[PDB]
């Protein structure tokens, strides 16, 4: 499944994930693709800050949904 991760510069990163991946797993895939440490990543989806132990499906994140990446 592809999802998009949009940075605050408007850059759209395409990420391959599984629908059951946890947010922590997603941050690890961003680390693998972009080289950003997971502790420096904050992901926002439809108004909510995403929590590490929950799954993408828990949040209703679907194919080609966009997560917003804020660096902390």
């Amino acid at each position: 499944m592809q999802i998009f991760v949009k940075t605050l510069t408007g850059k759209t990163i395409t990420l391959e994930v599984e629908p059951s991946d946890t947010i922590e797993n997603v941050k690890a895939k961003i680390q693998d693709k972009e080289g950003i440490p997971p502790d420096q990543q904050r992901l926002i989806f439809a108004g909510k800050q995403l929590e590490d132990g929950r799954t993408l499906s828990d949040y209703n994140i679907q194919k080609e949904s966009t997560l917003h990446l804020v660096l902390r």
């Binding site: 605050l8 904050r42 926002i44 989806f45 439809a46 108004g47 909510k48 800050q49 917003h68 804020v70």
Partner: protein, 31 residues
């Protein structure tokens, strides 16, 4: 509407009305 929460147009975070910049990314509410 003045007491309503508001979504940041940059990262979508749902912010408290007392803030005029986004709590997550500091984007101003009034651009």
């Amino acid at each position: 509407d003045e007491g309503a929460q508001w979504n940041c147009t940059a990262c979508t975070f749902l912010n408290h009305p007392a803030l005029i910049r986004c709590e997550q990314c500091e984007m101003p509410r009034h651009f």
